[PDB]
Structure formats: C-alpha cells, structure tokens
C-alpha cells in the first residue's frame, strides 16, 4: 500500500521522537506525495504559521517544482529569528532565511516531547562563527573559535571556546526557554502561464 496520491504524512513526521539540532538543521525533499497545506494551516496545533512570498490561503492551488522541509529545535525566544531579514545568534550562526524567501515558517511548543526532567542537553546551537551564515547555509564544523586577539592553536581554553553549546531543556523552564520545534517550507514554483496554474 503506497501511491503518489497518498497525502504527505506531515502529522507523523512532525510528531517524531527527536529533531535535529538547529546548527545541523535537517532538510527533507517532499516528493511524490500530495501535500494538503490547509490541513496544517487549519489545525490549531501550531503556534507560528507565517508565510512569505505566497499567500497561505492559496497554498493548495499552486504548482511547485520542488518543496523543501527544513526542521530543527530552538527556544521560543528565538522563533522570531526564523524570518527573512532577522538578526541574532540563530539567524546569524545557525539558520538564515534570505530576503527573497518564498515559503512558510511553522513552529510549535514541544515541551512535552523534547524537555526532560533530568535536563535535555543534546539539542545544540552554534554560538561563535567568524562570519554570518549565507541564507540556507549550514555549518557543522567544530573548529575552536578564536576570541579575537590571541591565538588558539586548535586547543580549547582561555579566550578559546568550543563553538557549540547545549540548550538546557527542562519542563520547568519558562515559556521562552522551552524548546520549540520549527519546520520551514521552501517553495519552487512552476514556470507556466496563468491559464494552467
């Protein structure tokens, strides 16, 4: 039982036990399935559902050559950085959206899924980088970051920090320090006359 008319299982994949750290954000190609974006948009499940370059009311009657689903986990404070032309630690060193971004940003609180009473220190974020990330770039290197003045010689220590730090996701956190799951849809439209699409 499998057909290209099967609806894309967004419900199942979104509900996964674990997501990727924002610094190594995971990217899927939605292919050979029917994506009904009204089922997401009209499910009151998601806190953030903001689209850019496209009206979300008319996602279902558009033609897409290529659809990308970028997924990761950040804190609720940082969800406002998942937008074009934003600044901060995430947008600059983890996940940058371009100014001409044509897609949708979907986010929802995942406290019950990603927070652990022991403390969940496995979701990471990048804290230092020589330059800001170009849009849709992904940096997973672990080179020892040089503060600015004195050399590091590839060894950690004073003014020489490991570029990745762990989030501290416990369920007693404030809403702003609680983990939020983010899914970012990237659209490629079909060059075609109005008469067809």
């Amino acid at each position, epitope marked *: 039982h499998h057909h290209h008319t099967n609806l894309c299982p967004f419900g199942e994949v979104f509900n996964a036990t674990r997501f990727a750290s924002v610094y190594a954000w995971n990217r899927k190609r939605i292919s050979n399935c029917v994506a009904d974006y009204s089922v997401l948009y009209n499910s009151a499940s998601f806190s953030t559902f903001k689209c850019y370059g496209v009206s979300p009311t008319k996602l279902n009657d558009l033609c897409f050559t290529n659809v990308y689903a970028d997924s990761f986990v950040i804190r609720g404070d940082e969800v406002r950085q998942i937008a074009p032309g934003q600044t901060g630690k995430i947008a600059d060193y983890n996940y940058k959206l371009p100014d001409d971004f044509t897609g949708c940003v979907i986010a929802w609180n995942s406290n019950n899924l990603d927070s652990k009473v022991g*403390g969940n220190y496995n979701y990471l974020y990048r804290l230092f980088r020589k330059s800001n990330l170009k849009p849709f770039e992904r940096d997973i290197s672990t080179e020892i970051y040089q503060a600015g003045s004195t050399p590091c010689n590839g060894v950690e220590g004073f003014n020489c920090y490991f570029p990745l730090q762990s989030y501290g996701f416990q369920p007693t956190n404030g809403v702003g320090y609680q983990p939020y799951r983010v899914v970012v849809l990237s659209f490629e439209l079909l060059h075609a006359p109005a008469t067809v699409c």
Partner: antibody
Amino acid sequence: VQLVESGGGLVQPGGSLRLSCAASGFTFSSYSMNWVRQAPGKGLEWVSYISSSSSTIYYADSVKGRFTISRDNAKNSLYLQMNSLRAEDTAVYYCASPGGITAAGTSVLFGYYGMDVWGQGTTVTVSS
Amino acid sequence: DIVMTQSPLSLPVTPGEPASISCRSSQSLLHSNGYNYLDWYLQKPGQSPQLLIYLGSNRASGVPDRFSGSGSGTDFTLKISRVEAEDVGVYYCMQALQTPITWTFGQGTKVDIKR
C-alpha cells in the same frame, strides 16, 4: 522510525558478519549509541556502548574480544563487527540511543533520560 | 554487578482496572544528585522495546497518564491506573546507575488479558 538496523542474517558458527544502524531525522553526532540484543524466547541483553565523540567504548563480558563497535558520524550510521560467532549469539539485535552527553574525559551520561529511540532490529541466526 | 529482580513473572490484567509490577535491586539506585537511575521499558508483541519511565518516576514522551513510576533507593513499582487492551506485552526494568559500563535489565513481566 529513526534508527534502522541491517546486515543480519544466517551465519555459520565461528564466522563473522557486520551490522549497521542508520540514523535519520535527528543529529546522530549528538547522542551516544547502544547495541541491545534479545535471544529467541529470552529477554533483553545490552551488548556495547559508544559515546557521541566515539571516544568512550564499553562492551559486555560475554562479547569482549569478539565484538567491536564503531560509528561514522559523517554517514549517520552505527557499526557492530561480530567476529568468532557462537550459536548462542542468535538473537534480534537492536540499536538504541540513550539520552545525555559526555563531558571531560570521564564517561558518564549527564542529564540522562533513557533509551527514548529504538530501532526495528535485525535478526541474526548462527547455525551450521 | 547489580541484580534486578522483577515480580511477578506473569500478570493477567482486566482492561479498566489497575495493575502493578515490582522491580527490586541488589544495591541502591539513588545517586548523590537525588535521582533514581532506573528505567522501565515495554515490548509490545512483535515490536521493539519502548521507553516508559526514565529516572525512576518520570514518564517518557507520549506515554499516557495511565502509567506512573514510583519507588526510591531499592524497591520501585510501575502502576497503570486503567489497564487497556493495547498494554499487553513484556515489561522490563533497567538500572542505569552504572551506565555506561553496565546496563542491567530485569527478567521481564509477561502481561495477559485476564479471562
């Protein structure tokens, strides 16, 4: 399912094969890995452990000097080389990921929260 | 080198009524930070093991209200307030105090539908 075992099958005693556990959907490099097997009828038995940075490795007494566990974070996969197989090694072999991270040189899981992700298991039958 | 002792071996349950499994350890599992390093797993028939309780008494993700872990030091217990049909399987407890050197499980507890 976010972990998928492969490579299991039929093998004659004294022989060898390698198992592979392929992660997808999360950052494989951030978690440690475990191999856990279940002999036919019997219960669960832990086999080996590899840290996130692949720097701290522990086996069990039953498989020492025979099994060697390894990981390749670039390929989001976990490996288990099973040499000098015996008939009692027949079992369904699971890969699972315990939560937590290792600090300094001493291997100890900080902020532990169990093996929240288990594979589907691959079956290994050792018989001549 | 810590010995887990589950009881009972088999446990019939009526859907809609409570149930209790016990796990006893040969040594205390209470660490000096105040956490009990003991997990509970469930292996539904023909299915992979599933995490139920971590750190002694805390439910894993997705686990319904019905399940709850308790106990401290050396005697721990699982408790299903309302057993339901799908809970049939084998329940293992696991000490985590000596991770990652040794990961010791219990014998398991097979669960039947009582009739």
